[PDB]
Design a protein around this nucleic acid. Sequence first.
RNA 1: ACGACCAGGGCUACACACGUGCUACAAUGGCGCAUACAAAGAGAAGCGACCUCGCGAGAGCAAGCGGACCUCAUAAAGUGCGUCGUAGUCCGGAUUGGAGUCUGCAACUCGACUCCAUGAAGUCGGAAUCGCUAGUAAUCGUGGAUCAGAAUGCCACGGUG
Lengths: 67, 178, 84, 100, 117
Amino acid sequence: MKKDIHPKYEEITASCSCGNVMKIRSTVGHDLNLDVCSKCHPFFTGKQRDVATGGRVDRFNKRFNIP
Amino acid sequence: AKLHDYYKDEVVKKLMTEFNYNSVMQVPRVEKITLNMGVGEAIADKKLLDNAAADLAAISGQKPLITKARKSVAGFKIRQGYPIGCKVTLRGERMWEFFERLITIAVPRIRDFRGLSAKSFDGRGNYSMGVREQIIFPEIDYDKVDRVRGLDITITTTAKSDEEGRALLAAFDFPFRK
Amino acid sequence: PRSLKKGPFIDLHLLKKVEKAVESGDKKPLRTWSRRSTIFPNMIGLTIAVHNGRQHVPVFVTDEMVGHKLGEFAPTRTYRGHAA
Amino acid sequence: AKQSMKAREVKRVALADKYFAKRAELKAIISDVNASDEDRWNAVLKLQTLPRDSSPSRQRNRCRQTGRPHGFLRKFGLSRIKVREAAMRGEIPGLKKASW
Amino acid sequence: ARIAGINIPDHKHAVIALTSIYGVGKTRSKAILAAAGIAEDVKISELSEGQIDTLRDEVAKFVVEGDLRREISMSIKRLMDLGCYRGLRHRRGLPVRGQRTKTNARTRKGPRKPIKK
RNA sequence: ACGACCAGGGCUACACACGUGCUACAAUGGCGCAUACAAAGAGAAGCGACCUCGCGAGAGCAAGCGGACCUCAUAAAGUGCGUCGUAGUCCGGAUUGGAGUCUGCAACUCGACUCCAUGAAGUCGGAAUCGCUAGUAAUCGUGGAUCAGAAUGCCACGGUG
Ligand SMILES: [Mg+2]
Ligand SMILES: [Mg+2]
Ligand SMILES: [Mg+2]
Ligand SMILES: [Mg+2]
Ligand SMILES: [Mg+2]
Ligand SMILES: [Mg+2]
Ligand SMILES: [Mg+2]
Ligand SMILES: [Zn+2]
């Protein structure tokens, strides 16, 4: 690849909330926290993911228990 | 890289039994991934295309090629040779790393994601999809983006038909609508 | 908003209908006038027809909609501009 | 005002008197910190079930003679016009024109 | 000096100077100074570098600057994407928190228009 | 049916123009801390002390009061001390994001209030035009009626002058 024309591309780590850590080469430069990946996305998994902190559904349950 | 090793280690065996290919050189393989942004508003502002190019460079890691109008078109007020687009061809390790990053991180990020279409195969096994918001990629920070844009992703394969193209992408757990 | 100590508010008839829709497939839209009821997680994926005062506007529930009222997704007034 | 509007206010007073105790018990359950959340939920739904007119907050003070929904004075139970008329006719004890 | 990527003014007393950081207002600034243990009537110029390093940690304890701006932008995008009332009002630049539109509403609308004619 | 009952919506719309207000544009001021002096009123499905909990709005417990007894209810401008230092600012507080609280079957349209963040316009207003001759104008706070809740309106009250 031509030298000095491409953005700095280096290996980084992406940690999903579920705790799945993936080693991906990328241009971000800083380690990045992730809220959802292919492993825990409901459509890919085929099952509703465990409610993660911050989600509107999660907030509704913590503040009030429906039963 | 990790996704390339998966293709040789797992995908070739699955396809060879499924389609009964006699030669390992007959299994479909991914050639290139082309990222395209049509900045048709570049006519009003040159900077808008530069910003799009910067976004494409952040998303893939390669300087984008600024595509120009093939012919003057009076309908869109474009004249032959005007820079109105950006494109990036990904091959090799960089292709396999973009593919991995896409399915693993960006695809599970589109709001109201019901699955990618499975009829978008072009008849020759080359898949094409269109991201309507670029903020799905982790390199695109929403704070410093001038305007939200979109990108066309084309995955060109050596597959002979649509069955063989769907199978190769399916073997990589591509999220088809099913 | 409504005090947390009180808990989220939902109409009883709508609550009944939604629970029946979870039990059966009930893809069919739920035609209701309860625009004051809060959106609960067990309604995600369902189509609720909320009244705008003249017509029931269909609304497909999503995850970001939980905790909001139904009436927030059925505009009641039609403004298309002044000179137009 | 209209006869229908007076009938409505009589029904509201009746339903609020008939259900005063039922509503009070549910509201105390709903506001009771100690009470179980399951009990609070049942009490909330039960209050929703009870008639709306049973709420005392749906009662508009109206002039007793006429039914006017505006200008009510609570001491007299009348609108400004009927209060003035009675004051001038001497039918309200102690009510005289005030200058200070 | 420079905290959270911005330079707090030297002449200003510490409490007012910290307010310059986005995401910091008199209440957070007063707390930061109580937690670090620095008197509010000290100028940033009087403050030593080591104290400034402590303040930077306290500022990190709170989302500020770009991380906050992004959060606000994303929330506004959430409302507009959802299609709620408050999202359509953000779309039309019309007041979102109830309010009247017949008159006033010029902070949201900006300067008046010549009746589009 | 131009009668009657109900559930939602509207009367709160918004290129715009006007009437009447409120709050400003600051240093005769802002803010912090300490501290002084009112009048007039309201209150039983009510006013609700003390104490405790919460940054707070508020909450829990609970006395008294049908009242010159108790409660709303600790007036504020003032004064003393510091700070700010003429800057769109330690001015201004509109707008908006996040989190609440209370009332009410129910606060989405469309309540008030709180907390954290944000920090518009505005640097004294053209032609014009309004009020006021003394405890008045100006300024500062207080109460009431309506009222579940919802005043910058209204009706009252005193402080300086
Ligand atoms: Mg009549
Ligand atoms: Mg009422
Ligand atoms: Mg009605
Ligand atoms: Mg009106
Ligand atoms: Mg200020
Ligand atoms: Mg008395
Ligand atoms: Mg200006
Ligand atoms: Zn995950």
